[PDB]
Amino acid sequence: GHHHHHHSHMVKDIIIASFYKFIPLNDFRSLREPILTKMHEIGIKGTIILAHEGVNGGFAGNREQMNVFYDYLRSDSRFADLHFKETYDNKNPFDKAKVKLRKEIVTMGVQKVDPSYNAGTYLSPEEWHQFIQDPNVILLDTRNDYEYELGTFKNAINPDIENFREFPDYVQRNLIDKKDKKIAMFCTGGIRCEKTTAYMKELGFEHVYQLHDGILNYLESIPESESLWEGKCFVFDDRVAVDQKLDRVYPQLPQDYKYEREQK
């Protein structure tokens, strides 16, 4: 019933969820207090970002805690189908519960980017695996410089940006003459590519593709022996990065990360 100690079958019994959803939230400001209160009651640590355009977050707890909190979030009909993508550790990688209100759930700094009309641009990990072996594909990391340096897909280009809002300028100065080229984009869990792909499609890019649910989805789906992933995958929490097995890198990476998704 949740009030009895019963250790998980797993040694890594802390669940770390990552999620996002683009859906208009007219009352998004009024959701902050109820969600935050439930995090406090249940003992969830993590950061959830709310905006008019939707929700994004990462948070952690044991299975009993996640059962209660998933159910709570999903009790809003607009969130009934939130997909919590899980990785696991033996430590909670978040220091406290935070809910932030923002202009965007991930800040690219461009006014009318509609991530609807992204239909046809998503590649599953299996499709992606085949797609990005083509040396003629422009394989483009959408992540920040600190992320790229820890690890990336084989042959991936680094846009060398400090913040996601620098991405449109990168497109404008580097890719505008390449609208008819195959361009494949990826990030940690998919959220940034939702905006980059929509933004570029509108600009007239005809062959832009994005890795569905990002690097973490690929690492879970593709066996390590075949994987085109190199190095470690940066994450926006205490773990700093995870390896191909989606485990916290050991020994622990320096935690001047810096972390949370608001800096992204």
Rg from alpha-carbon coordinates: 18 Å
The CATH architecture of the largest domain comes to 3-Layer(aba) Sandwich
Number of domains: 2
| CATH class bucket of the largest domain | Alpha Beta
Distance from first to last alpha carbon = 38 Å
- The fraction of residues in strands falls at 15-25%
> Largest beta sheet: what is the strand line-up?
4-1-3-2-5
The overall strand count is 13
CATH topology of the largest domain: Oxidized Rhodanese, domain 1
Q: Percentage of helical residues? A: 25-40%
Number of helices: 7
State the CATH superfamily name of the largest domain.
Rhodanese-like domain
InterPro entries: Rhodanese-like_dom, Rhodanese-like_dom_sf, TrhO, TRHO_N
Catalytic activity: uridine(34) in tRNA + AH2 + O2 = 5-hydroxyuridine(34) in tRNA + A + H2O
GO molecular function: oxidoreductase activity, acting on paired donors, with incorporation or reduction of molecular oxygen
Organism: Legionella pneumophila subsp. pneumophila (strain Philadelphia 1 / ATCC 33152 / DSM 7513)
Structure, described:
The structure is a monomer. By secondary structure, the protein is α/β, with parallel strands linked by helices. It folds into 2 domains: 1-106, Alpha-Beta Plaits (2-Layer Sandwich); 107-264, Rhodanese-like domain (Oxidized Rhodanese, domain 1), CATH 3.40.250. It is 26% helix and 22% strand. The strands form 4 sheets. It has a 5-stranded mixed β-sheet with strand order 4-1-3-2-5, covered by helices on one side. The protein has a 4-stranded parallel β-sheet with strand order 6-10-9-7. Helix 1 runs antiparallel to helix 2 and helix 3 crosses helix 7.
